[model samples]
Target: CKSGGAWCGFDPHGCCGNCGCLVGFCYGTGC
Candidate 1:
């Protein structure tokens, strides 16, 4: 997942497949 400033959903594609970021900006992992 992305290393942002919030803990959103799961990555399912990044270093942490089970770790996501916030739900808004098209940055971190998926929402």
Candidate 2:
């Protein structure tokens, strides 16, 4: 996990960037 949530796929500035409490682009934190 990152900070307080998991890593999200795609750019953090994109639509789903911060998807499901996550952040960043395609970080792939099991999400």
Candidate 3:
């Protein structure tokens, strides 16, 4: 889990830079 969410695999910002919430790769950011 991340912060307060699970692996949704949905990038709100698409797949360009940093948006999708992956597992074991949460860098304090969100999508």
Candidate 4:
């Protein structure tokens, strides 16, 4: 979630579908 510093949602169009995601300006995975 955005509260946890999560930039973007899962990339449903990626090869892994729900397992994939495109993060924003965040550095690491989570805050």
Candidate 5:
């Protein structure tokens, strides 16, 4: 977990970049 959330996959930002509480384009935390 990260900050307050859990793992989130396929989180595309489309150039916007890690939006604060973001995961990954594959796998990562929710922050």
Candidate 6:
């Protein structure tokens, strides 16, 4: 899961495969 800050959808590659995910831009956690 990304460090949410009103920035929705940030997990494009299932990176947030463990937390609150608004997935669409897998930029963190080495996606």
Candidate 4: minimum summed lDDT over ten consecutive residues — where? 11-20
Q: In model 1, where do residues sit more than 4 Å from their true spots?
A: 1-9, 16-31
In model 1, the clashing pairs are 12-17
Better of 3 and 5 by TM-score: 3
Cα lDDT tens digits for candidate 2, 1-31: 3332444455353332333433443343343
Score residue 7 of candidate 3 by CA lDDT.
Answer: 42
Clash count of each predicted structure: 1, 3, 0, 0, 0, 4
Q: How do the residues 2-28 of candidate 5 rate in per-residue lDDT, one tens digit apiece?
A: 333333354343223323334543223
Estimate candidate 1's alpha-carbon lDDT, on a 0 to 1 scale. 0.39
TM-score of each: 0.17, 0.17, 0.18, 0.18, 0.16, 0.17
lDDT of 3: 0.39
After superposition, which runs of candidate 3 have C-alpha atoms over 4 Å from their true positions? 1-5, 12-31
Clashing pairs in 5: none
Over 1-31, each residue of candidate 1 has an lDDT whose tens digit, in order, gives 4454444345433433343333532244432
| Model 2: lDDT of residue 18 | 33
Of candidates 6 and 5, the better by lDDT = 6
For each candidate, the alpha-carbon lDDT, in order, equals 0.39, 0.38, 0.39, 0.35, 0.34, 0.39
lDDT of 1 at 26: 27
| Model 4 clashing residue pairs (backbone) | none
**Model 6 agreement with the true structure over 1-31: per-residue lDDT tens digits:** 4443223454333443333344443344332
Global fold similarity of model 5 (TM-score): 0.16
* Candidate 1 lDDT score at position 13: 37
- Model 4, global lDDT: 0.35
